[PDB]
Amino acid sequence: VLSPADKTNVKAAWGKVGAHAGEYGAEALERMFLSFPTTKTYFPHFDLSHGSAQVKGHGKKVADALTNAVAHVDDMPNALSALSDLHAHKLRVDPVNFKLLSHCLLVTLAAHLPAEFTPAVHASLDKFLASVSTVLTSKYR
């Protein structure tokens, strides 16, 4: 649903991320690969070691997609439609994996935004990532 308060909270927190967007996207991916080893299999052509230019480049892509969702939060299904087809149809990404990356994105934000990661903002971000994940797994329903 994402309430008015949630949209404000997400825009505010994402706003503090700033030029760090891509770096945080990459850190989230790394935390995901280290914490949930099963996710690494989706990236065979990637070296996933720390400092990897591919994971850095891919972190920027993930951040840009999240930024697009924040910017068009009231029209998320349409905004992420092509990404939805890619992850479900072509990549066949297991739905559980979105919960894993969403958790790592929250951990990364909590680790970099001490003032902003309040319980209320943590809840809004969780709902935002749940919504993004629902859209990304919708070409399964």
Q: Phi and psi for 137 in degrees, rounded to 5?
A: -105, 10
Closer of 46 and 117 to ligand HEM (Cβ): 46
Binders of another protein among residues 77 to 136 (CB under 8 A) are 88, 92-97, 103, 106-108, 110-112, 114, 117-120, 122-123, 126
Taking CA 121 as the corner, what is the angle to CA 119 and CA 124, rounded to the nearest 5 degrees?
Answer: 110
What length does the chain have?
141
Measured between alpha carbons, how far is 116 from 44 in angstroms, rounded to an integer? 36
Counting beta carbons within 10 angstroms of the beta carbon of residue 48, is it exposed (0 to 12), middle (13 to 18) or buried (19 or more)? middle
Which listed residue (109, 113, 131, 136) binds a second copy by CB under 8 A? 131
Give min distance, CB of 132 to ligand HEM, in A: 5
- Closer of 8 and 72 to another protein (Cβ): 8
Could you say which of a second copy, ligand HEM, another protein, none residue 1 binds, taking C-beta under 5 to 8 angstroms by partner kind? a second copy
For residue 128, the minimal CB distance to a second copy (Å) is 8
Tokens of 24: 């945080």
- The residue among 34 and 71 lying less far from another protein, judged by its C-beta, is 34
